[PDB]
Structure formats: structure tokens, C-alpha cells
Write an enzyme that holds these catalytic residues in place. Structure first.
Site, PDB file in Angstrom:
ATOM      1  N   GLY B  29       0.841  -1.193   0.000  1.00  0.00           N
ATOM      2  CA  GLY B  29       0.000   0.000   0.000  1.00  0.00           C
ATOM      3  C   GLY B  29       0.868   1.231   0.000  1.00  0.00           C
ATOM      4  N   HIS B  47       9.768  -5.055  -3.309  1.00  0.00           N
ATOM      5  CA  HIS B  47       9.373  -4.351  -4.537  1.00  0.00           C
ATOM      6  C   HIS B  47       9.637  -2.857  -4.418  1.00  0.00           C
ATOM      7  CE1 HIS B  47       6.390  -2.676  -7.483  1.00  0.00           C
ATOM      8  NE2 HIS B  47       6.948  -3.621  -8.225  1.00  0.00           N
ATOM      9  N   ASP B  48       9.320  -2.262  -3.277  1.00  0.00           N
ATOM     10  CA  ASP B  48       9.650  -0.867  -3.009  1.00  0.00           C
ATOM     11  C   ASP B  48      11.129  -0.603  -3.142  1.00  0.00           C
ATOM     12  OD1 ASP B  48       6.954  -0.411  -2.397  1.00  0.00           O
ATOM     13  OD2 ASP B  48       7.283   0.000  -0.259  1.00  0.00           O
TER      14      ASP B  48
END
Lengths: 122, 122
Positions: B29, B47-48
Site C-alpha cells: 500500500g 518491490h519498493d
């Protein structure tokens, strides 16, 4: 954001946006120019215009919520930017659905070199 | 871009990313911080990190192509940025699929105020 937009297109049309709405005509894809080829293509032109009218926002990256009420897309209550971005996306997804009847595979992979008319103004 | 990422998550997990992977844990999120709650959440953290390692690129907005070969995601041949962005997304979608077995609805809507640990470094 584009994440929600892809899901909305899939949910409203039944079509994978990557295979139906990402390299189509003069506008459905990267780098729109010239005259839209058909109604589907014009949906993409209008969506581009809608995003371009939000320079105070980040339409491609600002996440938002939406849901359905009686089968129809209803944008969540977010910031003014989220609300306006969501409405751009909702209008485009609905436009694609309404114009499935004239979707033509022949416009897939249409070369940008032939999108050669003076680009339509928003 | 996020358009392709959403479709890849759906295609690899079978789950709508908007309802399963957009408000989950500390990282899946907007605004990641603290310690990832579980394996799924750690996918989002990674992923960030992967996107953060591409300051020369525009991971959320740069469109790319992908397809499948023998059921598996294969990134298209694009620019170096498109290739690297696609690999970030592919790794995350696969990570989510591999960790479905410990997905827990209890972490949906987890409040960011409780993501209160010193944020993990990439």
C-alpha cells in the site's frame, strides 16, 4: 493510478487492457498524435485530455479506491485529486465498454508515423 | 508501469490487487514503514526497494510489454529501464504467488500507526 485504471478497464470491458487498449490506433498507447481512428481511439484521446487537465495532480501514480454499486463503477471518497483522477478513468472504461461494438483489431499496432494529421486539441 | 504491475499480480496470483495487495500489512500500500508483518508484506518491501534502486527510471509510469512462455512471466525486450522495471514487477508477482499459503486477511487495513519499528533498510 494506472494500477486502478487497468483493473477498471478489465472489469468494465472484460478485456485485458495490455492486449486490447495499449497499442491501438493513434491514442491508445504511448505518445498520442494525429486524428483518432475510431470511437475506441477517441476514448483514449479524451482520457489523455482529462489527465492533462490535472497538472495539480499525479494521475498516473496517485492511488485511489473504487467499488461498484448496482454493477456500476463508483469512485471512492478521496482527495480532490483522487476523485478527479478516478472520474477520468471511470469515464474512459465506460467509453471503451460502450464502443466495443466498433472495436477493430485492424487498428492494433497502428504505426505512429501514419498518425500524421495536425494533432487534435483538447 | 503500475498498469502492467496490476495485471501481472492478477495473472500470477488470481487475486484482484486492489482488494488483496493495496492495503495490507506495513508495506503493501501507500507509505511503507516499520517491520514487514509476514512474507507477503515482505514482497511489497522488496518491490519498493527494487523501484527505489531505479532513480534513472520511472517505474510507476514507464509502460512495458510482457508475455508468458510455458506459463511463466517473460519480460519483453525493451529499454534497459523497461527491462529492470519489469523484472521488479515479475519478482513481486511471483513472490505474492509463492506466499499465498501464508496470506492472512487479518493484515488487511493494518494501521500505519502500528508500523512503528525503525524502518528496515533496503
Amino acid at each position: 493510478s494506472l494500477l486502478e485504471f487497468g483493473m477498471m478497464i478489465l472489469g468494465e470491458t472484460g478485456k485485458n487492457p495490455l492486449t486490447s487498449y495499449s497499442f491501438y490506433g493513434c491514442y491508445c498507447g504511448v505518445g498520442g498524435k494525429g486524428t483518432p481512428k475510431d470511437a475506441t481511439d477517441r476514448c483514449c484521446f479524451v482520457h489523455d485530455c482529462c489527465y492533462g487537465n490535472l497538472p495539480d495532480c499525479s494521475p498516473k501514480t496517485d492511488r485511489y479506491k473504487y467499488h461498484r454499486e448496482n454493477g456500476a463503477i463508483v469512485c471512492g471518497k478521496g482527495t480532490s485529486c483522487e476523485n478527479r483522477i478516478c472520474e477520468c478513468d471511470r469515464a474512459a472504461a465506460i467509453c471503451f465498454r460502450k464502443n466495443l461494438k466498433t472495436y477493430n483489431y485492424i487498428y492494433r499496432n497502428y504505426p505512429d508515423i501514419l498518425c500524421k494529421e495536425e494533432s487534435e486539441k483538447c
